Scaffold this active site. Structure first.
Site, short mmCIF file in Angstrom:
data_model
loop_
_atom_site.label_atom_id
_atom_site.label_comp_id
_atom_site.label_asym_id
_atom_site.label_seq_id
_atom_site.Cartn_x
_atom_site.Cartn_y
_atom_site.Cartn_z
N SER A 282 -17.41 11.58 6.06
CA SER A 282 -18.64 11.07 6.64
C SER A 282 -19.17 12.06 7.67
O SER A 282 -18.41 12.77 8.32
CB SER A 282 -18.38 9.70 7.29
N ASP B 113 -8.70 -2.36 -6.60
CA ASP B 113 -8.28 -1.62 -5.41
C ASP B 113 -8.46 -0.11 -5.62
O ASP B 113 -7.62 0.53 -6.24
CB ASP B 113 -6.82 -1.93 -5.13
#
Ligand SMILES: Cn1c(=O)c2c(ncn2C)n(C)c1=O
Length: 330
Positions: free
Chosen positions: A199, A35
């Protein structure tokens, strides 16, 4: 040193991925959920409340000659999905794919929440976010990666998740045969303890690319792609009959649909998520309403590039002094 381990989807939907991890001496092999959105290595154990164990493999520290109680240390964690676990702590030898760390904090669960109990395939988590998020008290502990880092050939790990197939976690090296083209690297902020990056935009299907900054985290422990409501609405508007259902808990779409792809930007580069990766199947057995793999992050407080996005790429987690993230197509 290096390590290399195969990671395998737990079910037909790629809800999560499990990677075998050797703990203790002799080795006890547990299948952990790696994770990158948390920083605790915790396991089902001989200490876990019996009624909360249902098929998981447990770590028994008393059977490990290298286990030592970390005296006074406790831990307690709650995840974004509302699940939780807590317990005490041992140090022991932990190996992943041939890479060994001695003195790793292995957090032994005394209690786990129902979603963990109900998932027999996950024996615990191995956190790969920054050690500043580790919950051990009163002495915070380091992640497996942070402990291994100095010994690694290069201070990196890579995630190469499969679509409906196994993939690979590598430590200490970049497998140049595992991706196509070049890797595009992008800046990371560690201020929230995550692999947080920005992004450069998105496109829906064959549509034009929208240049827009989207701050989010690269999180292998989250199934879906969670993005701003504007972006998510633009995606689902291209699927006839798709709608957001408050009763189901997100966007659903007719199972008869063909889903468009979704593209996200990494600098000037582009990662394309095929439409099939966005299908999470019937909301209940036999239903003709299917659950979407792109969902709104509104209310979460952060955008999350989960498995839906990451499994479309070869992803480099660069843990150099100034960390960065790399993405390549594959
Ligand atoms: C509500 N929901 C989910 O939350 C989900 C899912 N498949 C994966 N996830 C995460 N399905 C089918 C679903 O109905």
């Amino acid at each position: 040193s290096t390590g290399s381990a195969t990671t395998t989807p737990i079910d037909s939907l790629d809800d999560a991925y499990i990677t075998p991890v050797q703990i203790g001496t002799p080795a006890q092999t547990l299948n952990l959920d790696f994770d990158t959105g948390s920083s605790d290595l915790w396991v089902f154990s001989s200490e876990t409340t019996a009624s909360e164990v249902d098929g998981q493999t447990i770590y028994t520290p008393s059977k490990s000659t290298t286990a030592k109680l970390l005296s006074g240390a406790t831990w307690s964690i709650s995840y974004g999905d509302g699940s939780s676990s807590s317990g005490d702590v041992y140090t022991d030898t932990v190996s992943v794919g041939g890479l060994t760390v001695t003195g790793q904090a292995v957090e032994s669960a005394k209690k786990v929440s129902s979603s963990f109990t109900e998932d027999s395939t996950i024996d615990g988590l191995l956190g790969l976010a920054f050690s500043t998020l580790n919950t051990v008290s009163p002495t915070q502990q380091k992640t497996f990666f942070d402990n291994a880092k100095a010994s690694l050939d290069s201070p990196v790990f890579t995630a190469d998740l499969g679509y409906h197939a196994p993939g690979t976690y590598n430590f200490g090296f970049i497998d140049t045969t595992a991706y196509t083209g070049s890797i595009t690297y992008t800046a990371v902020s560690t201020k929230q303890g995550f692999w947080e990056w920005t992004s450069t935009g998105y496109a829906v299907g064959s549509g034009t690319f929208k240049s827009t900054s989207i701050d989010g985290i690269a999180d292998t422990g989250t199934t879906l792609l969670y993005l701003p409501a504007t972006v998510v609405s633009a995606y689902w508007a291209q699927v006839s009959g798709a709608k957001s259902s408050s009763s189901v808990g997100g966007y659903v779409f007719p199972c008869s649909a063909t889903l468009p792809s979704f593209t996200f930007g990494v600098g000037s580069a582009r990662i394309v998520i095929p439409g099939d990766y966005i299908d999470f199947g019937p909301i209940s057995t036999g239903s003709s309403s299917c659950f979407g793999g792109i969902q709104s992050s509104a209310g979460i407080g952060i955008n999350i590039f989960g498995d839906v996005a990451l499994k479309a790429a070869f992803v480099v987690f660069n843990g150099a002094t100034t960390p960065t993230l790399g993405f390549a197509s594959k």
